[PDB]
Amino acid sequence: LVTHAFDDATALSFDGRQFHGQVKAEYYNMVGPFGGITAATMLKAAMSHPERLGQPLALTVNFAAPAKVAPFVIEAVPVRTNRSTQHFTLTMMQDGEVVTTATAVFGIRRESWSHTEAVMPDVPPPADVPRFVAPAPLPWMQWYHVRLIRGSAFDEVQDATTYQWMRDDPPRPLDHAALAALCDTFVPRVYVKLKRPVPIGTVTFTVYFLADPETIFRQGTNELLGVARATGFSHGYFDQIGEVWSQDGDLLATTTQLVYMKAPV
Amino acid sequence: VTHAFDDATALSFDGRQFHGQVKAEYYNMVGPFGGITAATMLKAAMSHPERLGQPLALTVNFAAPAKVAPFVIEAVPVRTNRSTQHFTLTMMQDGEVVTTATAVFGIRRESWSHTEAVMPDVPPPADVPRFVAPAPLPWMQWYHVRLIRGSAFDEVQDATTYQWMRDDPPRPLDHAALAALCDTFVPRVYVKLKRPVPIGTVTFTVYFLADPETIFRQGTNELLGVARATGFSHGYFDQIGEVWSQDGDLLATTTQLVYMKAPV
Numbered sequence: 001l002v003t004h005a006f007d008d009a010t011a012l013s014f015d016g017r018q019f020h021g022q023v024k025a026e027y028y029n030m031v032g033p034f035g036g037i038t039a040a041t042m043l044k045a046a047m048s049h050p051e052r053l054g055q056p057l058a059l060t061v062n063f064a065a066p067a068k069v070a071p072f073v074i075e076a077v078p079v080r081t082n083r084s085t086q087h088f089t090l091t092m093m094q095d096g097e098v099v100t101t102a103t104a105v106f107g108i109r110r111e112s113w114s115h116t117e118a119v120m121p122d123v124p125p126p127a128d129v130p131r132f133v134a135p136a137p138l139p140w141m142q143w144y145h146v147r148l149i150r151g152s153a154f155d156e157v158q159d160a161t162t163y164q165w166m167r168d169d170p171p172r173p174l175d176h177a178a179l180a181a182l183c184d185t186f187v188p189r190v191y192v193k194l195k196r197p198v199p200i201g202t203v204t205f206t207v208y209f210l211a212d213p214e215t216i217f218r219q220g221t222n223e224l225l226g227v228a229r230a231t232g233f234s235h236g237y238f239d240q241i242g243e244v245w246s247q248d249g250d251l252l253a254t255t256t257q258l259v260y261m262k263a264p265v
Numbered sequence: 266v267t268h269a270f271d272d273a274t275a276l277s278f279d280g281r282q283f284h285g286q287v288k289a290e291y292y293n294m295v296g297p298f299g300g301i302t303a304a305t306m307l308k309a310a311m312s313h314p315e316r317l318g319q320p321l322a323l324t325v326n327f328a329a330p331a332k333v334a335p336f337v338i339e340a341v342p343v344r345t346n347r348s349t350q351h352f353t354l355t356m357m358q359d360g361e362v363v364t365t366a367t368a369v370f371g372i373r374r375e376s377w378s379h380t381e382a383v384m385p386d387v388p389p390p391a392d393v394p395r396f397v398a399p400a401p402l403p404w405m406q407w408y409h410v411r412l413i414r415g416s417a418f419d420e421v422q423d424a425t426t427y428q429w430m431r432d433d434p435p436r437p438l439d440h441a442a443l444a445a446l447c448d449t450f451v452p453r454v455y456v457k458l459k460r461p462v463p464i465g466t467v468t469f470t471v472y473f474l475a476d477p478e479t480i481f482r483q484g485t486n487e488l489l490g491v492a493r494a495t496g497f498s499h500g501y502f503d504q505i506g507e508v509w510s511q512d513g514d515l516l517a518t519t520t521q522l523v524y525m526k527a528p529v
């Protein structure tokens with residue numbers, strides 16, 4: 001029996017009222033844990049809830065304050081339940097104070113007419129792209145295999161747009177929470193733009209899972225292509241818009257991020 | 266004489282909760298209007314005794330379409346930090362939850378600025394005629410929309426809409442108003458399929474990227490909305506949007522996630 005780190009970080013227990021977990025120090029980022037893991041964690045809670053029906057649709061996580069690397073507690077309410085659809089409200093506490101909050105939508109979906117409006121960019125295969133290793137690694141970075149295509153802080157690239165191949169490392173089958181996490185695996189837009197770091201932190205993170213659950217699972221350990229772009233940077237904040245595609249060209253999820261930023265003049 | 270929007274979002278604090286009334290003037294055929302609903306949620310947080318700072322972000326989930334009736338809202342300032350604060354809000358009609366939301370307040374400080382995305386080149390409001398829809402919903406009489414691109418009547422082959430928008434009759438722009446304006450877009454799915462289908466918004470998000478001083482300066486003027494979609498599969502599609510001042514200032518961005526009935 002071997003535990004994958006991810007399943008290890010997001011491991012929870014239910015006492016019948018609240019969920020218990022530990023912030024893993026191995027997922028640390030700066031000034032608190034990697035956002036994607038915290039969000040994946042926020043999602044399992046509702047997923048592991050007994051009342052929970054259907055599969056995930058959307059997730060919005062708001063980081064109220066950087067989580068200590070401590071045990072924490074999550075209280076996940078099945079706030080509304082309808083035929084095909086379900087809404088959750090979640091709260092994570094450490095030492096009696098609110099650390100993180102999230103809302104989620106679960107639902108049972110059936111097949112419809114489908115089309116894909118966005119274009120998948122034309123890119124080389126994971127074969128041709130070399131894995132990218134940062135000179136100063138972040139603890140959680142070790143948990144992902146990223147082949148960077150364009151858009152880094154080392155690039156000559158003058159816009160904010162990033163392309164990357166990414167998967168869990170070591171390889172892990174794909175599911176919803178893992179997928180949420182992969183959406184915070186993007187280098188902060190602002191670094192990409194300035195080629196040097198500034199202090200930043202994420203206030204809020206949203207993710208929509210566009211692909212039906214079956215499609216998502218289909219990927220198994222196959223690598224994925226993320227695309228993160230930025231919109232603007234003003235008066236202390238900026239935003240990240242991003243998409244995640246299957247190697248086949250199927251659009252898996254879309255995400256947005258609102259991020260505090262410290263750059264003065 | 267008060268303004269309808271201001272009538273719709275008017276709330277009274279009993280010391281614990283907020284009390285307001287869904288108003289039919291704002292009805293949408295399916296249930297009430299998302300934007301008005303969303304606005305009220307934020308109005309709650311701003312109106313809270315404990316509010317600190319100005320709006321940053323808001324996400325709203327519609328658990329169930331609200332009936333036209335009185336409601337209460339529990340707005341909770343879940344954490345209050347030095348420079349930043351977070352709310353969780355719950356609208357309830359008859360003890361069953363209708364709507365929830367999470368808001369972020371905080372302070373905008375002078376800092377570095379660049380804007381990455383390109384505001385499209387479009388005709389000024391003047392040279393675009395106001396588009397009045399053939400079958401209007403009650404909430405529609407409260408907005409003035411000049412439609413440049415992307416309608417269900419258009420010849421367009423994609424999901425992308427450009428338009429000019431402001432409240433009618435005019436009211437000085439504020440955060441709540443701004444939020445509402447983001448639900449103004451014809452659902453992406455009409456635009457592509459060039460025909461109306463059943464839809465609903467499960468979830469909606471507005472980031473406010475312009476500092477408050479910038480938002481307020483807009484005052485009474487028309488804004489450019491820009492809305493697109495990434496994809497449609499298995500009952501849902503999404504909507505991405507941007508809101509620009511005329512000066513080329515980026516004000517907000519939005520995402521919406523939307524139900525659809527579209528069998529093969």
Ligand SMILES: [Cl-]
Nearest residue numbers: 032063201202
């Ligand atoms: Cl964080």
Ligand SMILES: [Cl-]
Nearest residue numbers: 077089353355
């Ligand atoms: Cl609650």
Ligand SMILES: [Cl-]
Nearest residue numbers: 256518519520
């Ligand atoms: Cl957004």
